Structure 1
Amino acid sequence: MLKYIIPTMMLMPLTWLSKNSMIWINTTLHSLLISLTSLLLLNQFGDNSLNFSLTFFSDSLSTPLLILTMWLLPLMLMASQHHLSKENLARKKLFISMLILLQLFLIMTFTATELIFFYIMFEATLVPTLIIITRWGNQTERLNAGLYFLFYTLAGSLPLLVALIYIQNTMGSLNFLILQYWVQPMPNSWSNTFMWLACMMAFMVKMPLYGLHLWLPKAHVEAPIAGSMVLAAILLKLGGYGMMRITLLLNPITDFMAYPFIMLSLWGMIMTSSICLRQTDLKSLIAYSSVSHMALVIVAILIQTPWSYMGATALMIAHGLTSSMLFCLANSNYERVHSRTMILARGLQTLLPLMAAWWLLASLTNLALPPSINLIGELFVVMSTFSWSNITIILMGLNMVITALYSLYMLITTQRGKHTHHINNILPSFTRENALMSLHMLPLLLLSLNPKIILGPLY
């Protein structure tokens, strides 16, 4: 993975030695070159993973997450260069260095062969994200939101540290390749009960679990646009990646430990979706929709069937692209009206027709329109949870009504109706903004032509 780690590190002298008018264009160019090189991870086999070294490997789970991670950095640079145009030059370079450092932590989070190196990178991803939210967020509440984002994660994850070192002492290793072959059945006990909780609650916070999700509609709202893109597109998927690695070690106890959490997600995706019906803050509406979509990934991991893991990784990649595009659209209005209130600027299809087409496509992929990979992941999780219990389709289908209802109401409030009369600074869409929308949406629609690369280790 060192062919991806060293170019990401060389982005640091690339961004600190550039000319002052050149520090966006060079980083965008070479991050796009790294994302072009990211397709060499697709050397995946039907039997074996692509095992690079003692430290790094990549199966078909980490590979779409790595391509999405290396693809999201140029899009974050495009999104975050307008509102940081008036910024000091050294602080602008520090912002770009925090995004580069976060990508550098993420690409060896997803490729960590050993689980405590996974933990170290997985918790190293806090510090650039925390600094970005609490330094380049706009409002007052970013300090409090950074505290919530920090201390839900660490309160969930410092038990995970003790649990991983306990597995290290018991099994002798935390190599995932060794633990594929040395995994022992985890019997029913209270010791193994709190073992399961210490392995799972950090990722339950990262997904987020409903009830633990309170950090998210602050940390995804009080952040700048690049922070919201990396949080909702990648950093919610560290939890699903970690669960799909760690439930190997937690059998057969998971088969009854999952029952409360599944309820917390199956009811949670009813509640949070319903919350999106009555949100005034558009960025908070996208945040509670993110909680609603990640509840399905929690259910699909906790029922641990093949169709569920395929649908869960498809839904994670699809939700990454979709929610990142939705945050970028909310920023495209917020750079014009300077308020995140959704009822403020209405009827924007009368003024921005192509941007309203981007809103339409993002909302149709949000409501899981076939044959988008949003619907592929949605539908496969629905199939596997129907095999889990035939009643859950009700809680699925009612969700699939409300998921439609907030996706179009967001379209109806922002883009339709009569426009707001007193707002007259609605500029035409810049080429940068439509470029960002197309670089979100065109990969998302091209993946419908060949979805087997985003279906994970057991396609």
Structure 2
Amino acid sequence: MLKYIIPTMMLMPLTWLSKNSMIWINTTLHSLLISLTSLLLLNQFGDNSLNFSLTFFSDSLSTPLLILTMWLLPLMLMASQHHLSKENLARKKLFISMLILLQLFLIMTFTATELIFFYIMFEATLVPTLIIITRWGNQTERLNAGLYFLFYTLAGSLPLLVALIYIQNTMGSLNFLILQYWVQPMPNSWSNTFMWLACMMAFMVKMPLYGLHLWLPKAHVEAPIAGSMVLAAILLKLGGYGMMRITLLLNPITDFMAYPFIMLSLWGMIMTSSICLRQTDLKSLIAYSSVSHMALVIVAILIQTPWSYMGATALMIAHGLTSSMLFCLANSNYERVHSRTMILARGLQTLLPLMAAWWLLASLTNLALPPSINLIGELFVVMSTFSWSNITIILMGLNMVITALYSLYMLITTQRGKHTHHINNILPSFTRENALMSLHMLPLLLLSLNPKIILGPLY
């Protein structure tokens, strides 16, 4: 994995030794080269994972998350270079250093063979994200946002640490490859009940679980654009990755420990999607849509069938691309009208038609239009939850109504109707902005041609 870790670290002298006019160009270029390099992780086998060393491995779960992570860094640099144009040069380099450091922590979060090293990289991701939100977020509430993001995580993750160390004392190892063969069944007891909660609640916070989700519509809203891109696209998926690894050790107790959380997710995706119908802040609407989409990934991981894991990893990759694009579109309107109020700037298709086409494609992927990988993940989770219980289709199908309703309402409010008369600073779309939208949307649509690389380890 060290052929990816070392160039990601070499981005640090690359950004700190660059000429002052070259720090976006150089980091964008070489992060795109690292992202091109990331496709060598697609040496996956039908039986074995790609096991590099004692410290690092990559199966078909971690590989698309790695490719998406390494792809998101150039797009974050493109998204962030405009609103940091007037910034001090050293603070600009510190911002890029926090993004590079976050990429470095993420790529060895997903490839960590041993679970306590997964824990340390998983929690190490908090510090650059907290710094990016509280230092380069725009408003006052970022400070409060930085507290919620910090303290819902750690209150969930410090019982995980203890739990993992307990497994270290019980199994003798936290190697996931060893734990594939030495896993013992976890019977019904109170000790194993709180073992289950300590193993699961940190990832439940990261997803987020409904009812634990309150950090997200502050953290993703108050963040700068690169912060929101990495929070929605990658850091939510640390929870899903960690659940898919940790539920190996939690059988068969999961078969009744999942029942409350499944309810919290199945009703929660009804709630948060409904919340999106009455959001006045566009970026808050995109955040609540992320909570609603990750509720399906929670249900799919908890019912733990092959179809549900395939749907959940497809939905994680698809939601990463779609939610990152939606935050970038909302930012492209924020960088013109300087307000996140969705009803403010209307009729934007009359003024910005190609950006309206990007809004259309991102809305269509948000509502899971076939054959997008959004629909592939959505549909496969719906198949597996119908097999779990046939009544879930009600809460599934009603969700797909509301998901359509808030996706097009967002599209109707901002793009359609009459333009606002008094707003006259709607600049034509920059090449950087359309480029950012296309670098989200074109890989997302090309993955429909060959979705087997985003279907995870039990494709």
> Under TM normalisation by the shorter chain, which class is it?
over 0.9
Aligned partners of 1:221 and 1:153: how far apart in 2?
17
Aligned partners of 1:382 and 1:223: how far apart in 2?
32
Deviation at 1:91, TM superposition (A): 0.1
Deviation at 1:325, TM superposition (A): 0.1
CA deviation vs aligned residue, 1:246-295 (integer Å, no higher than 9, x gap): 00000000000000000000000000000000000000000000000000
CA deviation vs aligned residue, 1:160-216 (integer Å, no higher than 9, x gap): 000000000000000000000000000000000000000000000000000000000
CA deviation vs aligned residue, 1:335-394 (integer Å, no higher than 9, x gap): 000000000000000000000000000000000000000000000000000000000000
CA deviation vs aligned residue, 1:277-325 (integer Å, no higher than 9, x gap): 0000000000000000000000000000000000000000000000000
Aligned partners of 2:68 and 2:347: how far apart in 1?
33
CA deviation vs aligned residue, 1:99-124 (integer Å, no higher than 9, x gap): 00000000000000000000000000
Aligned partners of 2:422 and 2:228: how far apart in 1?
29
Q: Which aligned pairs between 1:218-367 and structure 2 lie closer than 5 A?
A: 218-367=218-367
Aligned partners of 1:379 and 1:199: how far apart in 2?
28
Aligned partners of 1:35 and 1:103: how far apart in 2?
11
Deviation at 1:237, TM superposition (A): 0.1
Aligned partners of 2:454 and 2:404: how far apart in 1?
24
Aligned partners of 1:374 and 1:155: how far apart in 2?
32
Aligned partners of 2:90 and 2:47: how far apart in 1?
48
Deviation at 1:398, TM superposition (A): 0.1
Aligned partners of 1:322 and 1:341: how far apart in 2?
21
Deviation at 1:224, TM superposition (A): 0.1
Aligned partners of 2:234 and 2:247: how far apart in 1?
20
For the residue of structure 1 that corresponds to 2:23, the secondary structure is coil
Deviation at 1:149, TM superposition (A): 0.2
Aligned partners of 1:303 and 1:422: how far apart in 2?
52
Deviation at 1:30, TM superposition (A): 0.1
Aligned partners of 2:340 and 2:187: how far apart in 1?
50
RMSD over aligned Cα atoms: 0.1
Equivalent residue, structure 2, for 1:436: 436
CA deviation vs aligned residue, 1:3-42 (integer Å, no higher than 9, x gap): 0000000000000000000000000000000000000000
Aligned partners of 2:98 and 2:315: how far apart in 1?
27
Deviation at 1:70, TM superposition (A): 0.1
Aligned partners of 2:70 and 2:371: how far apart in 1?
25
Aligned partners of 2:223 and 2:316: how far apart in 1?
21
- Structure 2 gaps of 5+ residues are none
Deviation at 1:92, TM superposition (A): 0.1
Aligned partners of 1:23 and 1:291: how far apart in 2?
34
Aligned partners of 1:191 and 1:197: how far apart in 2?
10
Percent same amino acid among aligned pairs?
Answer: 100
How many pairs are equivalent? 459
Aligned partners of 1:281 and 1:252: how far apart in 2?
43
- Structure 1 gaps of 5+ residues are none
1:455 aligns with 2:446: no
Deviation at 1:225, TM superposition (A): 0.1
Aligned partners of 2:169 and 2:440: how far apart in 1?
44
For the residue of structure 2 that corresponds to 1:188, the secondary structure is coil
Q: Which aligned pairs between 1:24-423 and structure 2 lie closer than 5 A?
A: 24-423=24-423
Deviation at 1:419, TM superposition (A): 0.3
CA deviation vs aligned residue, 1:131-155 (integer Å, no higher than 9, x gap): 0000000000000000000000000
TM-score (norm 1): 1.00
For the residue of structure 2 that corresponds to 1:268, the secondary structure is helix
Deviation at 1:83, TM superposition (A): 0.2
